């Protein structure tokens, strides 16, 4: 009688489906994975760059079923992208490990498709957490691994020993273009709140604390008469923010997060940056060696603007976002000389509708495009005066 | 452990063995006779993915589509008739067409086993016994290290090494060889199968002297 | 409206429409088949000019002269003879030998017509009925969109469609395709003719799957 994994992954496996994508922006051709999350609605988060820019998405199950998606939502900051399949029949979903209670050493399994070979199973350990620093712009507080992973990993599952997701296999270090022991996965935390969000309205609300700041080294804690060697150095609060409110001030090191300690300042930012405006929360803060507790609440924030390209697939040259709660797709702002400024689009524009179906939110907006009519009539309101716009 | 998926010709976590059980069936056969003697069911095919089985209304995903079946072929006799799937082969599931191929064609010659079949959303099974195939020939620099341009193989059960067919222009028909003929024997020792021929080479004599047989005619072939 | 006379792309006065009798018969078959089954009485022929009817003692400046009669044709059981002048079709006078090629062109087969002919100046009638021709065959390109080098066409009446001919080298050859098959089927649906055939590639599926039958066997083509 011999030690497996068999008996934990006949049930898991399923759960991982593979995604095939043409696209354009000039055809391209890509594959990967992708976790199933909600067996009835057939909802399926993956990787944002394995479907960046798709016109045709496809995914096959373990058992062999094809199937088509459309795109419900998408972070190119977190790279986590959200996608349905079209008639979900018999779907088989995944439970989500609580990611906060990993530690360096517990065992992985790695489920796949690399190289399109079909789904492959491999397995390793947690290499270390929090790490960070592969791209500077983005939110990262990946796990890392060394189970192999390669290309068509990505939005592949990273679960435990029982069959839970803890990770979403997102990229590796490898200068030969093939794995070499070092693999990063976004934590299975992260997964569940931008996706819960996408599900309702299409993008990420991110909210803001309103503080500038940089990573506490050694070095930075001798000059600052600090104790601790790690956590975010507070450089400067805005003014009229919530950390201004809280009672935050310059010079002070957040060591914190809900109890839970931090990392890092690129951590940190990741945490918040994936939590939904209003979320209440509170930060543990070290400042003249004094211990302090603040509560804070999320607010607006400037980063929630997103290309029009990325929803109508070729529409470059305006920005757009949810706005207020349900009140319809507000446009941001608009470039010169780009083709949606070419059939009207301006900035300041709100879609309330398009072809004679409400429109709420990026996600309804989504649904009306999925349709896939040959032209496109929206309803926009510029001031107090309703006007449309066609396409095609 | 016969290959790796590796772009820089080194690991990086895929690699790829051959099963024991295809080890245990190829591996018996060389013991006895020198060489695999090929069974085939006689049946063309491809793999059955989700949009053929839709064509086909067919449920499941995978497995074997019979595109057609050859005329007295063993599967014929069996009755297996074109857009039949298979399913399963001796009870076990079936990944693939390419893995169905992969284990009848270890197995040997008139063994005997039973095919799971789908056809019209109907479950059939059938009794099935492998026959004689093409692909039994091998080439002869293979036994002669260098000896090209005949291919050869055992023929019925110990007569000896019949040669399949011969190419002209090259270094085996230079000393004589013609396809039909059939090794009896090598320097006076006798030859039933390609094994005990090698066992002659072993020895690595300066001349080889093969007693082979044209026709109705018995001649000898002289080698260095 | 079909043409123009133009030399500069532009109209000037001269246009030409296919009469409305011919539009009739070639669509009514159309409907029902798929494609048109020609019909032939087996006579070679050409313009009666009057120079041509001065050599040939005949009256007539204007018909279809019989060079010679196919054996084993309808004319030629109906009583035609070579040197024969046609001047009308069912009672319609002929215009031309061009136009009576027209005319029949365009009725199906075994349709019952009857010929004015004018045999050494004497006025003949005769009654005929069409027959198998060899102009049946199109091109697989035109139900494919696509794939060339294998001509067929409907067989017997609803019996599937027959393969014609094939070309060596041809994009519908690489698939299998052989003269002499004959398609029964696809994707599961019954197919008589052209028509049933074109019905099912206009769901336009991403895998076509040809039920044909080669001699007594029958067999799959799968397509994508």
Do not use: W
Request: hydrophobic share 40%; aromatic share 4%; glycine share 10%.
């Amino acid at each position: 009688q011999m030690p497996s994994l068999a008996p934990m992954l006949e049930k898991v496996m399923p759960s991982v489906v593979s995604i095939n994508v043409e696209g354009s922006t000039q055809k391209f051709m890509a594959l990967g994975s992708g976790v199933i999350i909600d067996a009835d609605k057939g909802y399926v988060v993956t990787n944002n760059h394995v479907v960046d820019n798709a016109t045709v998405i496809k995914v096959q199950l373990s058992d062999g079923r094809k199937f088509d998606a459309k795109m419900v939502g998408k972070d190119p900051r977190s790279d986590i992208a959200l996608i349905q399949i079209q008639n979900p029949k018999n779907l088989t979903a995944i439970k989500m490990a609580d990611s906060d209670a990993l530690r360096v050493g517990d065992y992985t399994v790695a489920i796949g498709n690399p190289f399109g070979l079909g789904e492959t199973v491999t397995s390793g350990i947690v290499s270390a957490l929090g790490r960070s620093g592969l791209n500077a712009e983005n939110y990262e507080n990946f796990i890392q691994t060394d189970a192999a992973i390669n290309r068509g990993n990505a939005g592949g599952a990273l679960v435990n020993l029982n069959g839970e997701l803890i990770g979403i296999n997102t990229a590796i270090l490898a200068p030969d273009g093939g794995n070499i022991g070092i693999g990063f996965a976004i934590p299975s935390n992260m997964v569940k709140n931008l996706t819960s969000q996408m599900v309702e309205y299409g993008q990420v609300k991110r909210g803001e604390l309103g503080i500038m700041g940089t990573e506490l080294n050694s070095e930075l804690a001798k000059a600052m008469k600090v104790d601790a060697q790690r956590g975010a150095f507070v450089s400067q609060v805005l003014p009229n923010s919530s950390a201004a409110k809280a009672g935050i001030k310059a010079g002070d090191v957040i060591t914190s997060l809900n109890g839970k300690p931090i990392s890092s300042f690129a951590a940190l930012r990741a945490q918040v940056g994936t939590m939904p405006v209003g979320s209440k929360l509170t930060l543990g803060l070290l400042r003249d060696g004094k211990q302090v507790n603040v509560n804070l609440e999320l607010q607006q924030s400037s980063q929630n603007q997103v290309d029009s390209s990325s929803i109508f697939n070729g529409i470059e040259g305006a920005e757009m976002s949810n706005k207020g709660k349900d009140q319809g797709v507000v446009v941001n702002n608009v470039k010169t000389g780009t083709p949606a400024a070419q059939i009207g689009l301006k900035k300041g524009d709100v879609i309330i509708g398009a072809n004679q179906q409400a429109v709420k939110n990026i996600a309804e907006l989504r649904k009306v495009l999925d349709s896939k009519p040959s032209v496109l009539a929206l309803n926009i309101q510029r001031g107090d005066s309703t006007i449309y716009l066609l396409m095609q």
